[PDB]
Amino acid sequence: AADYADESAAHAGDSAAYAATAKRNAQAAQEAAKTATAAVTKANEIFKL
Amino acid sequence: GAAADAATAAEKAEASAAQAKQHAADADASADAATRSAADAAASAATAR
Amino acid sequence: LIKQAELAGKQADDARKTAEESSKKAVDASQLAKEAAQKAAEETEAAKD
Structure with a gap:
């Protein structure tokens, strides 16, 4: 049971350790989305001007 | 979420x-x-004999 | 500006794929953690018996 508890903790540890960094990819995607949006916004303002 | 559940x-x-x-x-x-x-029982058996 | 948006689109997409892989990994890991927890639970119940 102790060995299985450690295995469980190991799986949880791996999930959390990866998720804790993988969530930064979502943030990176948000930054990229904002970047693309900004590029479009600038393009629209330039066109109008 | 999965990591949190795994941690739980x-x-x-x-x-x-x-x-x-x-x-x-x-x-x-x-x-x-x-x-x-059992050890006491053995002593009792020795006593009974 | 469009080219920059295209580059931003690419990493938003690459980040998306990574995040999706993370989701699957975290879920498989949480499934393994739950199974490990259940295995520990089964051993615990065995210990009780």
């Missing part, structure tokens, strides 16, 4: 293992008492 499962698993260790400890206490009882 790990905490429960560790708690369960802790209980299992106590159960084994209690089982040992019973086995040790049983051993002493």
Whole structure:
């Protein structure tokens, strides 16, 4: 049971350790989305001007 | 979310293992008492003889 | 500006794929953690018996 508890903790540890960094990819995607949006916004303002 | 659930499962698993260790400890206490009882029973058999 | 948006689109997409892989990994890991927790639980119940 102790060995299985450690295995469980190991799986949880791996999930959390990866998720804790993988969530930064979502943030990176948000930054990229904002970047693309900004590029479009600038393009629209330039066109109008 | 999955990581959080995994962490929860790990905490429960560790708690369960802790209980299992106590159960084994209690089982040992019973086995040790049983051993002493058998030892006394043997002494009683020697006495009866 | 469009080219920059295209580059931003690419990493939003690459980040998306990574995040999706992370989701699957975290879920498989949480499934393994739950199974490990259940295995610990089964051993705990065995210890009780």
